[PDB]
Amino acid sequence: KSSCKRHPLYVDFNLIGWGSWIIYPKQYNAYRCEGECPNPVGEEFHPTNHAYIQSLLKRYQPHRVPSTCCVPTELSAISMLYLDENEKVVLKNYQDMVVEGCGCR
Amino acid sequence: KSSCKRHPLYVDFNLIGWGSWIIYPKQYNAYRCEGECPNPVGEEFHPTNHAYIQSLLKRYQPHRVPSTCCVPTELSAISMLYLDENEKVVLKNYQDMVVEGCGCR
């Protein structure tokens, strides 16, 4: 907004040197979280109790308390087809690969 | 280290204007997470798959990818004794009040 929210993140496995073993997908949208977490953190950013308290304390003490941080709070899996160290073909569901929700923590 | 890790955070409820309703505890150590998350993120920072991939991508693309962020990854509850809006005394376990573990996310 520039407040904490989800944004695209296009990951190309060729770029990070993994294209020799990952067969599919070579590229995928992993998304990302980015944006400021205001003090105090409103309910729309789904803070934990701890995050809310830290953000309120930062209002009253801006120089000794760090802001809470915009991070993934819900993630989902993708299936990847790849070659293992023995060149066996493996199909596996990898957890926590795609950001589905962001929040201040 | 200054790498991502847990640090103290002394919360005084009197300071944030909640001392009129919270009876106990008036102050508690909530802790906090703070410190850099290196690229790529090592196993010691307990990254998710997504956090690891984002951090590796940032190595190869430092200007378009944000660093992963040091946040609470495990939290615990505290019991609070307080007065509600009707001045009834309530004893309740509040979740997510104390940081117990930090990681890059």
Swiss-Prot record, chains A, B:
<comment type="subunit">
    <text>Homodimer; disulfide-linked.</text>
</comment>
<comment type="function">
    <text>Essential for mesoderm formation and axial patterning during embryonic development.</text>
</comment>
<comment type="similarity">
    <text>Belongs to the TGF-beta family.</text>
</comment>
<protein>
    <recommendedName>
        <fullName>Nodal homolog</fullName>
    </recommendedName>
</protein>
